[PDB]
Amino acid sequence: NSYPGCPSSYDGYCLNGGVCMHIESLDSYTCNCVIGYSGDRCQTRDLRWWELR
């Protein structure tokens, strides 16, 4: 089940926000994109539109 989890890294692999997880798998470690942007890692950022702080 979806649950936070990522090696010491994943501390800034994604520019935009990002919710670190491990996904039910022998590996897989990433940060879920956000509301307003997506792609490889929300790189396709629809600019300031949502959360400022």
From Swiss-Prot:
Disulphide connectivity of cysteines: C6-C20, C14-C31, C33-C42
Domain of life assignment: Eukaryota
EGF-like domain residues: 2-43
Span list, region Not required for full biological activity: 48-53
The name this protein goes by in its record: Epidermal growth factor
Organism for this UniProt entry: Mus musculus
Lineage: Eukaryota, Metazoa, Chordata, Craniata, Vertebrata
Gene that this sequence comes from: Egf
Residues of the full protein shown: 977 to 1029 of 1217
